[PDB]
């Protein structure tokens, strides 16, 4: 598998992630901002979406924290909450894996 499913729609990402554990996620091309990515993340009761923005140096960010690559952004949010309303960490393996 892969984190990255560029062609998945927002609703398709919701459907896929409803079948996954909290913190599982997919990175897709944004429908609203076509040259950018969106990260969809399974929360406890639903799936929420984050826009991956770019600064004038080409860094990637969600909030204020900047990263030179999507990979570094993902790895940061394994340890730090991606959500400001709840504590949610990105995950991509089950506990049994």
């Amino acid at each position: 598998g892969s984190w990255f499913h560029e062609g998945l729609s927002r609703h398709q990402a919701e459907n896929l992630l409803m079948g996954k554990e909290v913190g599982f996620f997919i990175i897709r091309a944004s429908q609203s901002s076509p040259g950018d990515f969106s990260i969809s993340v399974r929360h406890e009761d639903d799936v929420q979406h984050f826009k991956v923005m770019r600064d004038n140096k080409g860094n990637y960010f969600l909030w204020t924290e900047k990263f030179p690559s999507l990979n570094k952004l993902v790895d940061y949010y394994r340890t730090n909450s991606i959500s400001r309303q709840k504590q949610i960490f990105l995950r991509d393996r089950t506990r049994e894996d």
């Binding site: 979406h49 826009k51 909030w63």
Partner: peptide, 8 residues
């Protein structure tokens, strides 16, 4: 649509 980190 709606994104959690959309701010002005």
């Amino acid at each position: 649509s709606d994104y959690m980190n959309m701010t002005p």
